[model samples]
Target chain A: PMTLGYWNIRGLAHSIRLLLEYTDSSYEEKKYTMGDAPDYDRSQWLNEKFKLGLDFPNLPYLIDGTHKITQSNAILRYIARKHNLCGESEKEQIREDILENQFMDSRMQLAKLCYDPDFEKLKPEYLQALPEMLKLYSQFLGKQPWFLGDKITFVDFIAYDVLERNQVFEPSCLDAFPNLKDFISRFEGLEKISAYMKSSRFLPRPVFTKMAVFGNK
Target chain B: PMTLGYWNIRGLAHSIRLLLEYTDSSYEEKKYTMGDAPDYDRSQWLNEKFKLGLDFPNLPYLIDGTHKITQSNAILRYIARKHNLCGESEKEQIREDILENQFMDSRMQLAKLCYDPDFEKLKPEYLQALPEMLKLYSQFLGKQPWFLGDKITFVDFIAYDVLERNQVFEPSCLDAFPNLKDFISRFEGLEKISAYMKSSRFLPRPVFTKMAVFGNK
Candidate 1:
């Protein structure tokens, strides 16, 4: 079975987990734990990190027999391609790729709010910027149920993740953007996602703290 | 003919331009001029943005016939896929994706040195962090001509761009990583890229100043 190795938290691995669940791909998650101390006990990952045959070993790596890949977006795309979830054609795949980047870029801005020492000062700027970005998504999502089109692609999960994070910052982040608002609920309404959210496996709080500089919420 | 739209700066479009050169793809860059005022005049771009039919409708957008795309890496990969510069197989493509994201991630750090008002204070942090990242790349690169293997993939352009930028910060940046050093010269030696580098078409210096808020060298 494929095994995804990441911290126990739902940081970058949440969307990967969602994809695995939605596709019915049987996989195990090897989540590393944080100790009582301030730093993460990454020995579980770092000790064997060099031996994994990864070109560039980092957290949230996927191990499946001979193949090892790191970087969450890469892992997501790999699974998406394997399961026919990337998109229908090269052009559609291009569409999917851009949305994925936008999703990550949006999350990155929110991440600054969480980690930057200037978070208190930056919060208002982020709050003001939220609607413009949400509107952009609403425009791209347009009338489609998904960001790309009718069929759900990998970008949908990314959109859901960022929108979820956005709402954490501002309760009404999506109020003006009906398409994005609908996207959040629609994605959560999916059978597997809904089940996963309610399951014991779900992580309600962050695994890593603000001091953790890498990965997403 | 193909058209790429972006600000007057080489910015995020350099890698895309390099890929086009290597592939011999006939494309013209539509660079928008930054005016005498302090802010970027994106009106030239925004005026034509909606008509391009880009789902995201951002600068660094590409149009080839009816097909249009946005986001720099996506544009790079689209051209890579078109020219067979994307890796050879699914596993290889996964490696490529990780490297591509890693490239951007590394670039994001260096970007802080250029744009952040506190870059002078932040320079030491970036300089201290450079070797660890360079070491990671050097180890992954090993003896391979490229990050993945023997072939030149899209990530090569990204790596070259960052390594080249690293040199700007510290003149002897690549002296520690011979493979990356050679990789820079090797990539530059490519006939098309070398020609483009010498041609008037390229913006040798950044079009915008250190005050520029987005993209990299």
Candidate 2:
């Protein structure tokens, strides 16, 4: 068994949870809840952040026996490598590497917008750029069963998470790309993922922390 | 020969350039120079941005034969995989993965602060948090010949680039961490890296674009 620690919200750990369930890995969550309003206290996490023995202590850490990993992508790779979900061929590896970082860049853009105090003013510009961003993803994904062709890689988990968040942010955002919508559906239809979504343990709200201007609740 | 295109400043391409030189790859650079303010015209990059055949189409792109990659880390890995610079053993790979993402997070914090319009007001807070951030890195690098222990992986290039930028931002920043200072010196002492630094092709200044409040030159 292993321990995965993060805020109680969906936040960065959503994909990791999905992957763990998909792989049928035995793990327990150490969910830290932030106090409401005013202070929105984070001491729950801060208290044990340094005590974890992680090289770079952060939210969303995984401790599997002697292997303690932080950084969401690192955690994903650690689990993926175990199941051989990381790509095999050079071309597949290249695509995996590119999309993994590209998705992070897109995810952060949306995150920064949501967390900004002036999110209302910034919303329009972010929306304006949204289609172009999706277009690139759609093109990259192009008719393939997954981002890296027929085989599913760890990057698929990241892509599914980020794209799903965008759809939640704007209901009609995925209307232009049927493939992306199908990608979401295809990912959800996976046996473990579908089961996990129905389980009481699943968390799909409060996309960000209380500090964010949107999706905090 | 492949084409590596980016701004005529150091920015994100510094590490990529260092890796290319270290690998002894045959490549040419398409450096786009930004025009003078007030416009800080980006037509130089914008003009050919869409025509480059890049899937995501961004600066610091690498076009090798039929393959085209964007995102700095992705570019680094593409070259690294060729030279077997990506880590080997599982532990080495795990360390590489964590440091790679961690360095990017730290790099963005510095970049965001440097590019902010309120840079003067933001400087103190950034400087305040700087030591703790560097300490985490110093502790991570602790006594290892490179970031991933005995072997020098692609992340060492990233570590070197980001740590170097921080040192430029605050000359005495690495003083407290003798190991970090030695790591920088050891990296610079590498045959290829030392040659690149002395060559006329090196672009060490203007770490950020003209839009940035600091290191814009």
Candidate 3:
């Protein structure tokens, strides 16, 4: 079984396991949680007992049989290649990489906001950055239906999936990014991902949980 | 000449250019430095002209012919595949990507120390974090002389170059990082890249210029 190691439904790892689900790959998932405990020590779980090699420059690492792999994005790309997710051409494949990262960066930026609730004090900054960022993303998407020009690519699915995860249906988030709300809806309406989402194992983000992405303020 | 839009020698862009040189492709690298001018106007550059068609999220972007590509690590992987710098097998190529990023995250932390002067005050924390990180990196290097098993992938060059780029020789930096230091020294000892570094065209930062320097502090 391919073994996935990450904190439960933590932002980067969730997208990875979703990719595997898209491929219907059977894998064991091991997860950690900071929980409500203030000390929330991360030391014990990082031990050798987990059977992960590659101490891995830190995880979201996965093991396929004997080979241990790390780096969240690289793992995504690797799975995409195996499942024919990139695209049909050299150019399309390159575009897939470019497009995935464009959306991923913004998703990650939103995730960082969870890490520091002081962001609420800077809600104006969020309103400003989000509108500008989404305007750019919207114009880009309006030009092309999916990330890779006319056809769907692996980037189209993962990039959109990860970006949408952060939206959380929050009024504060969606109020400023109506285009993003509509964009995520259009992307999910696709048959392949919708089919996978209906499958028993799909795990969406727990943004509603007490698990604040930001540390204790 | 092809155009590269990235802040020179910071973040992921540095390694992307290192990959480009390995391929010997001709391109004009347009680097925007915060430079000596303390108060700089980003609108002077990041406006309509640059952000036109592709508002790529975080650059290390390459405008190849007509393509506006971003995300430095992904761009390097694309270039490596196109140039055959990647391995014979797809598994091997994926292995190279994993290895490169594995080293990259550590190099990024070290780079923060070199470029960000905060370490001068936070010396204790910096010193504490270094050995464990260096020890792990050293352990990985011990497993394979080059990053991607036997052959020299761009991963090795970039990973090694990062350790060397530290402005201060920080013998303290080398105290527990012998293997990593030796790994970097391998590049200086290489025939082609060594010759490239010797050329007047190649620019290693003064790192301690009186007025201007790029990125971080």
Candidate 4:
């Protein structure tokens, strides 16, 4: 009885989707437009903030039919906890959790830089800083198959979706870091995910398509 | 069997301290400078990142005796679960975890603006957005004594600490949002926290005073 509601974009919601699929758990993803996001009568929005006490509210809420959790990252961890995606042991799992958050924090900062109006000004920094960040990511990735090595925990999806989202803004985003590029390429092509692409629900996001690449550059 | 490796600043580690104290757990707050932090065989740097797989690799790491955990937000949740800072009921507890993370996320982003060079220019935007965000928090706080309402939970500690950290950064940070200011004051005066703050390890820091009045304009 798991359900998620979010705007159909590769923001916070994207990672949650990957996690649900990773756990092979049955879940529903309900995408909404800004027009549909308001009005508690909408059923979906009703449960997001008003019911959950989300200070900012909306986008990427998990309706754990029985649990009613609202925050996006919390939902990921909550699900990961139940599904054993946390890690092989409590210590390793907790370590993975911390690293994954810093990873996400770094990624989100990257996004704010990318999507903000100052993309032109920030471009040089990303060109320089991002390469280093991505390389550091490679060093991290080299240690484990996923975020915690060997276990493919929560970070795998977050790192994957983060790289995925960034590439949409700048395809070469991962180009500098060969290890990460290959890692992301492999994740997008995962056997289970290859099947996911078959469904109309998956594939390139509108903002990150070749068009975004062309117009973006 | 626990120890804390963090500065005495309320920025991130305060809630962890509160959690430890509330749970009646005993631990040393290794409040050390870079040079003296190595008083232990493991340098503070190594000890902090000892559990590399745990977080994005940052501060507020814990030595759960032999088990090391990092990522303040995630560590808070784990601590809440391991101990019973979660509150009286299970449902109230999960809600507390979600709210605590969200509350911490917003609070941290707000605080970082004061120091993170990247966010320097965005002060106007942050200040602009603060009103709306506080309004939402005001509404949420008005509904419950603690974040889950009436029950003392981890969420309340996280929220109270976040608000306190902000005021420590800019005393007037909550002036505009009277309800939020009141909420924070009410929680800070709560019996458990009032006594905990007086402990030698928990005394306020000068860093708090510095940030408390950084840029009021």
Give TM-score values for chain A, per-prediction. 0.89, 0.96, 0.79, 0.78
Considering every candidate listed, which one attains the maximal lDDT?
Answer: 2
In candidate 1, position A106 carries an lDDT of: 81
Model number with the top TM-score: 2
lDDT of 3 by residue, B8-32 (tens): 3345666676666767877777765
Candidate 2 lDDT over residue span A72-128, tens digit each: 999999999999887888899888988999999998899987878899999999888
Model 3: TM-score, first chain: 0.79
> Model 4, A15: alpha-carbon shift in Å?
1.7
Docking class for model 4 is: acceptable
Candidate 2 per-residue C-alpha lDDT over B1-217 given as tens digits, one digit per residue, 9 for 90 to 100: 9899988877798899899999999999998988976768889899899999889889989998889998998999999999989888889988888899999988889888866789888888988899898899899889898989888889999999889988988989999999999999999999998898788865545456566757564
Give TM-scores for every candidate, taking all chains together and pairing residue i with residue i.
0.87, 0.97, 0.82, 0.70
Q: For candidate 4, what is the recovered fraction of reference interface contacts?
A: 0.62
Measured with C-alpha atoms, the lDDT of residue A27 in candidate 2 is 97
| Per-model RMSD to reference | 3.7, 1.5, 4.0, 6.8
lDDT of 4 by residue, B57-96 (tens): 4566776766667677667867776865565565664666
- What ordering of candidates by DockQ runs from best to worst? 2, 1, 3, 4
**Candidate 1 residue pairs in clash (backbone atoms < 3 Å):** none
Residues A74-186 of candidate 3: C-alpha lDDT, one tens digit per residue:
78777777777667677776766666656666765665566655866654676566667656666666656666777754676666655565455244555555656666776
Please state how well chain A of candidate 2 matches the true chain A, as a TM-score: 0.96
The regions of model 2 sitting more than 4 angstroms off are: B204-209
What would you estimate as the lDDT of candidate 2?
Answer: 0.88
Give per-residue CA lDDT, model 4, range A1-217, as digits (tens): 5778775445578778877776788998766543322231334455544655444566677776577666776778788877777676666656666666666677767666645666667767765666656666677667455657666677688788767656765688777677788887678777777677677776444543221122323
**Consecutive 10-residue window with the lowest summed lDDT within model 4 chain A:** A208-217
